[PDB]
């Protein structure tokens, strides 16, 4: 049978992505919108 190690260090290679866990701040999402447009025109406006 040509023989191999009785131990087997490879087993945790079954573990899943990841890598790591979270982050999640406690109540708000400030600047995730990455600074695109949020308004239209601009300068002098209307009148009737």
């Amino acid at each position: 049978d040509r023989v191999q190690s009785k131990i087997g260090s490879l087993d945790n290679i079954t573990h899943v992505p990841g890598g790591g866990n979270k982050k999640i701040e406690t109540h708000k999402l400030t600047f995730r919108e990455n600074a695109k447009a949020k308004t239209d025109h601009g300068a002098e406006i209307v009148y009737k």
Binding site: E25, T26, H27, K28
Partner: protein, 150 residues
């Protein structure tokens, strides 16, 4: 004894209390020089912004170390918009932590609600407008009727 600089607003009220060796007309002559220096600023709806009192029993003071012992003294109590900074700082320092919900878990563990921080911080946002409504002057300017509207 408050660190709002009294130049940062206007008085509405002043209640001063003399004690000791004091004269009713020296008081009167002192306060005319406080009223004359309108640099010391007032709410424009309160011409009569001052109350006096005079009592003849000296200032007495508990002993220890080196301390002055005088024959006359004054307490004043005074209301002024200059304090509104303090309130605008305390409700900002509040809102800074509260937006992250910092320390809120200790409080809510005792049975308090986020509505109660909510009604409080709002009540100071009502009080923000309420120091300032009374801060606005009693005239909104003027314009000439002789000029054309078109």
């Amino acid at each position: 004894m408050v660190k709002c600089d009294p130049r940062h607003g206007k008085y509405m009220a002043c209640c001063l209390l003399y004690r000791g060796d004091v004269v009713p007309k020296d008081v009167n002559a002192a306060i005319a020089t406080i009223k004359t220096k309108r640099s010391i600023q007032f709410v424009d709806w309160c011409p009569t912004g001052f109350k006096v009192g005079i009592n003849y029993q000296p200032p007495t003071v508990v002993p220890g170390g080196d301390l002055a012992k005088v024959q006359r003294a004054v307490c004043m109590l005074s209301n002024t918009t200059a304090i509104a900074e303090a309130w605008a700082r305390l409700d900002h320092k509040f809102d800074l932590m509260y937006a992250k919900r910092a320390f809120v878990h200790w409080y809510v563990g005792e049975g308090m609600e986020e509505g109660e921080f909510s009604e409080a911080r709002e009540d100071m946002a009502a009080l923000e407008k309420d120091y300032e409504e009374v801060g606005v002057d009693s005239v909104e300017g003027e314009g000439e009727e002789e000029g054309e509207e078109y």
